[PDB]
């Protein structure tokens, strides 16, 4: 297909686009709200600044597509392939991303407020400055992602893999870290106040770095907090 | 006896003054060293700046005596009664004070270096500025004592009673605090580095105030340290 016809079909009211092959199309600024694109081929497409609010995209191939600044509020992205896509400043508020492939996508300054990321693969993605406030990250793979100054206050990180992630200056207030793997993560300036750390695997350096006021912790973890401040046993 | 006869007997070489009643005497500056005054009644005596080095004072009644500036180096004070005495700026280094009564005495700027204070009652005394370096305070009673800026480094405080004591800015480095009771004590600016706290009864506010680098602690104490900084259990 080509750009003219897809702009023109939607304006006539066609919303069922699923399985269509739109590979590398130039769809910038296109207002696509409510379209059913699930299982489409959007590889390397330019959706930059597109309006995809409430779309059905699940299992689409968006790998390396330019979504920067697109409107994805409440869209259905479950099990999509976004690997390497450009989502910076995109609006994913409330979207469904569970089990999606986000590896190495650029999420800088995007908005994932209350989105569903359960079991997604975020490894190596750039989330710098993002707002995930209250999102569902249970069981996601955040190996080496950049979360500097990301807003996770209140999110569910239970069982996520944060090994080697960058949490510097990140807002974690009231988040759930239960059963997380924090080995290797930079916690410089991180705010863990009131978070739930119980069961997590953390490096001792976390204790000297993140503000823990009100954090919930294990006995074995509480011991290591003190030992991290010099107390001998 | 009177002042003339006790000074004159001493110059003749008589050292046996024990059980004699010298009450309220003016002995200022008098060199009495090595004298046996044990079981004397020295109540309200003026002994200020007298030279008593290696004297035998044990079981004397010195309560409310003016000992200011006296030289007690290696004197035997065992079980003496010093209640309310003025000892300020005295040198007690190496004396034997075990089981003596020092309650409500003024020890300001004294030197107790390496003295034996085991079981003594120091309650309510003003130890502001005193030097207890390496002393044996095991089992002593420091109830409500004022220890501001006193030097306790290396002392044995195991099982002593520090309840309601003022430890503000006091040096405790490497002291033995095993089983001691610090409840109610001001630990502001206190330096507890390398001390052994195991078994001690402490307030959570002790953990927030006193420098604890390297101190030895219980399993249960490490937790109570952590919780003192906000970690919830």
List keywords for this structure.
little secondary structure; Pectate Lyase C-like; 2 helices; homodimer; 233 residues
Tell me the layout of helices and strands.
2 copies of one chain form a homodimer.
Chain A: H1 3-11, H2 219-228
PDB class: de novo protein
Keywords: synthetic protein, loop design, de novo protein
Assembly: dimeric
Give an account of the 3D structure:
- Chain A is mostly loops and 233 residues long.
- Chain A has a single domain (1-233), classed as E3 ubiquitin-protein ligase SopA (Pectate Lyase C-like), CATH 2.160.20.80.
- In chain A, 8% of the residues lie in helices and 0% in strands.
- The first copy, chain A, has two helices and no strands.
- Chain A has helices spanning 3-11, 219-228.
- The longest helix of chain A is centred in the last third of the chain and has 10 residues, at 219-228.
- Chain A is elongated, with a radius of gyration of 19 Å.
- The PDB classes it as de novo protein.
């Amino acid at each position: 297909m080509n750009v003219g016809e897809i702009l023109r079909h939607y304006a006539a009211g066609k919303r069922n686009f699923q399985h269509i092959n739109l590979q590398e199309i130039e769809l910038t600024n296109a207002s696509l709200t409510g379209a059913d694109l699930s299982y489409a081929n959007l590889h390397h497409a330019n959706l930059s600044r597109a309006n995809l609010r409430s779309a059905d995209l699940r299992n689409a191939n968006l790998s390396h597509a330019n979504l920067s600044g697109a409107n994805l509020e409440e869209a259905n992205l479950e099990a999509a392939n976004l690997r390497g896509a450009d989502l910076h400043e995109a609006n994913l508020s409330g979207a469904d991303l569970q089990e999606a492939n986000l590896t190495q996508a650029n999420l800088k300054d995007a908005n994932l407020s209350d989105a569903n990321l359960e079991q997604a693969d975020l490894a190596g993605a750039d989330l710098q400055g993002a707002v995930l406030d209250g999102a569902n990250l249970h069981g996601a793979d955040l190996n080496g992602a950049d979360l500097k100054q990301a807003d996770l206050s209140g999110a569910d990180l239970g069982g996520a893999n944060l090994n080697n992630a960058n949490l510097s200056e990140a807002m974690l207030t009231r988040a759930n870290l239960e059963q997380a793997d924090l080995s290797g993560a930079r916690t410089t300036g991180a705010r863990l106040d009131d978070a739930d750390l119980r069961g997590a695997t953390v490096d001792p350096v976390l204790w000297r770095t993140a503000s823990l006021v009100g954090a919930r912790v294990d006995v074995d973890q509480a011991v290591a907090f003190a030992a991290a401040h010099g107390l001998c046993l």
